[model samples]
Target chain A: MEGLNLVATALAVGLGAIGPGVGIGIIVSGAVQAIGRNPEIENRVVTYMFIGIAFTEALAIFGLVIAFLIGF
Target chain B: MEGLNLVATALAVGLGAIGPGVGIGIIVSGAVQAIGRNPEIENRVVTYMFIGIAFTEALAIFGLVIAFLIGF
Candidate 1:
């Protein structure tokens, strides 16, 4: 059981990051494509991207919090 | 078994976020590119983008809630 706790915690954080990692990649790809087509709207597009990323990141944070809860 | 349950809960939430994270990135990227190409359509694009983001985020939220249920 003790080892299980450790394993679970590790899995929590490890797997949690996967979501945001993939998400961020998709976001950047889109941003790049958009920027490629319209450099003029760079600022606007980047701003939106940041907002989107932030929200996505929240999920990871939640997972971390849950891991801590379980560990302690 | 309790410890194992905690671990499973954590994994559930963590793994859950991965899908939405990437999904949001894809949605935002497309929105950004669309708006970048046509600044005039910024209003509509952003509005729709947020709506899409909300739906994607809901999945993560569900994961979080599930985690809590499991942990508790």
Candidate 2:
């Protein structure tokens, strides 16, 4: 049981990061390319980018929290 | 129980990834086209697109974590 909790935690963090990580990478890359072509609205785009990341990152954070709770 | 856990993990990760994978693709495609049409707000639009993807992908991440927990 004790070891199982740690296993769960490991899985939680590992699996939780995968999709969001890849998605964020895709977003930033596209955003960067768009900005390179048209730099005028860089500010607006960057702001939106961060907002998106914040929301996306929240899911990973939730997993971490759950892992912590389960371990404790 | 062991077999069940593995099944749960597989299902968790598999089903979890489906929606977000499609969603991120759709989001990027739209963002790309949007930027192409409206170069003026390229940065702004791209940023928002990123934000949307991040949030959308987060659900997948959560599913992964849950799957891990179940497997553990």
Candidate 3:
């Protein structure tokens, strides 16, 4: 609405991406490493990995939504 | 002028879907892998996994609904 207020809204959405993005990246990387180390458990590893990614992304999206709310 | 609100609403729902979709995929895969590994634990594994998925999905659904509220 005001000058710096708009910046806060922008920051909210932008910063929101930070947590989830980093989380998912680390999660996938870990999953990949696990899969490589224990190929036999690939299926299970993948399943859990995906779950982690989903939650992580959800949090990020939440941030984005909150940002939008603040903006408009 | 107000279309931006719709975009935000869309992001909310879209983001909500992302979590459950990815989470369910992982949960199912984990369940499958567990069942495969220990056939005897099939029932318990599935039950627990589903419960977990449902809770996880509920969060996303809540977000979607809130977004709708904000939009409409």
Off by over 4 Å in 1: none
Which lDDT tens digits does candidate 3 get at residues A1-72? Answer: 123434444444434443454455455445544543455776787689779867876876777577667656
* Model 3, residue pairs in steric clash: none
- Residue A40, candidate 2: Cα error in Å is 0.4
How do all the candidates rank in terms of lDDT, highest first?
1, 2, 3
List lDDT for all candidates, in order: 0.83, 0.62, 0.56
Cα lDDT tens digits for candidate 1, A32-72? 88899989889998899888878777777877887888788
Error at B8, model 3, angstroms: 0.8
lDDT score of model 1? 0.83
Error of 3 at A2 (Å): 11
Report the lDDT tens digits of candidate 1 across residue range B22-43.
Answer: 8887898889888988999899
Lowest lDDT block of 10, candidate 1 chain B? B1-10
**Model 3 DockQ vs. reference:** 0.05
Q: Native contacts retained by model 2, as a fraction? A: 0.07
Q: Which candidate is the best by DockQ?
A: 1
Total backbone clashes of model 2? 3
Residue B3's lDDT in candidate 3: 54
